[PDB]
Amino acid sequence: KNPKSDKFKVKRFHHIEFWCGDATNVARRFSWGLGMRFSAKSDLSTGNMVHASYLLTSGDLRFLFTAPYSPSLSAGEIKPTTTASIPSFDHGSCRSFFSSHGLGVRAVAIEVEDAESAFSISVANGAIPSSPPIVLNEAVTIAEVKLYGDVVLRYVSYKAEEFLPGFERVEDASSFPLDYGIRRLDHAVGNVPELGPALTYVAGFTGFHQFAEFESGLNSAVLASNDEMVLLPINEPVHGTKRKSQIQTYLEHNEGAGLQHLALMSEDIFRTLREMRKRSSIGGFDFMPSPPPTYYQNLKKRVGDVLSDDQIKECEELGILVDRDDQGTLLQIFTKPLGDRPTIFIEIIQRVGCMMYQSGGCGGFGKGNFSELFKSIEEYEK
């Protein structure tokens, strides 16, 4: 059941912005680890005396890394005379965010038809405004409202129908064409102390609807746009369990609510994981410990009609997890945390089925892999 109740026209995920202390080192690490190309910049070399911002792209996926310069470089500026390319940026907010949370996502940005209308309708329906609509070079409009914690939902709309004005394309000599197969952001997941009030708030101002699902330490629910291509799952911890909830660990180490993981769709998850795993110990990303062979022995009875024995052994080599709902099949794997704190991590996913284009959320989000991993663990103990 999809009531298609969006209160304004939403297109697709546009970009994800990390707030950093040094944008250069995080961007360069991420570029090598994930196979993303340096495509645009806004920094001292482009006249930005306020913040350094570097954009990585892989297919339609856009990762932005931003850090503040010394305020003294821009102490003479006022908002009318700012050299910042992202006018919502604030030195104090950014330093407060990074000191509170460490490295993490500040903005989940979605493209809309009309960012000024989206902002107005959202705030009229309970959204807490974060940065009012601002028109950049008469071409792009950006506005921000609070999503959860210190994470904002960023609306971006373009008149034309090239990232943002004041960003410059990166010199091809500095722009190496890395590509490990990642193509787009599939979903973005938040952790909160209380799921109910978080859902009521976000569904309240967006009109997003609850996306149908099928001892883990969590309760979760997924908000979706009309065509279910913008997917925003939210988790709360379940307390009193034998094993401590990873949602509660997140909230403690993050100093509260924030973005838990980014799920990145790959057009070939086997190629992506081969390429990422080759770089784990040479500057890239690490992956969670693989499931036992019993898990992959049990893959025959569950998805033997979807993957061959060879495609299943390839899953075992790479530690890929597999889940399935009534519509389709999900291949997924999780990285270890991206930075110092046990907070944000990345998911790589590929979805099989639901062809009409592929419909959103085909195969679900892998909640079956909680019980399946418990089973395979005790089963492998033997």
Next chain:
Amino acid sequence: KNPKSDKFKVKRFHHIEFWCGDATNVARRFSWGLGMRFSAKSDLSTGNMVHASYLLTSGDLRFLFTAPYSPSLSAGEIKPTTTASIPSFDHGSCRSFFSSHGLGVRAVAIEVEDAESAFSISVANGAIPSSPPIVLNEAVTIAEVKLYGDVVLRYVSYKAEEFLPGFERVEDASSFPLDYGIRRLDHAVGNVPELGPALTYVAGFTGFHQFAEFESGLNSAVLASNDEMVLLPINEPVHGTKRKSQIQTYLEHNEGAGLQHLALMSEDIFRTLREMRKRSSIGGFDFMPSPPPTYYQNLKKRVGDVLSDDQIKECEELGILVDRDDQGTLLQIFTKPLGDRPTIFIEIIQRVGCMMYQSGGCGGFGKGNFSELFKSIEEYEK
């Protein structure tokens, strides 16, 4: 002339510590870019609830990357009950340092015979104390005094004659044996507003002596230990020049004095620069723009008795600079800034001559390359 006036016994450079906002991403970037191995850690997995610290090694070179956790993780601790492995660490100091300066060196650490004696003698001779001597697991003693800006000179002494107590060796699966030929720290350079008072201060409390030298925007001088293996150059800006002093640009973007560059000795600078340059656009480090061919044409008359025509063409391919004093020859090159701000960078060097072992500072520090580059620039204009 070397009076050998050290006021306490100094051995060698021990390590360099960067203060970071996220130690993981900087360490992983540096490891790939410079070919350094992950060798030790102190973090949540080792019981450290205060700071995350990761050590990279290449030969005798030790780079330490440290970032603060949320203070809430350790809010119940007191200094007697601390879980920090580096007891001088302070959350507030570290956040204040990174917000003021961005990514940079907090500590230049030298090994001494007796860190408690070095601290006492230094402070008795004018050093500003930063952290008093503390004995770690009855095995290592660490003490810190102010060097310049917010950079400290760190004394480390060992009873035995394994980095620091509470650090753990890194699992060999997570420890990839990268090596591009870098072997040790040759010198560490500071930028200050006023060279005179900075030299008087540091020479005052160490007994280090001035190391003999042979429109650039700087005045400089080099302080050296008794065997001239600890080398601490210091720069001040020269104002009123046609081209703005890079020392003044450093001071402005850094919010004052601090460490300008680290010079890393390579056992084979050609291999090091081939390996680093292959990785510049895939997560590693960039190099300053190469000198014109006239510079390399003029390399015949200056060092033709030291390098063959083939060893000189190899310099031209890699953009290596060459200088020479009355004792030996210096091959060197400079990276672009390591992070967002035009502040800290790295020098790669190899020294030829002065065999007795090789004596310290053989060939000087390349101050001849200022005039030689001006000449080659206008000469290449032609």
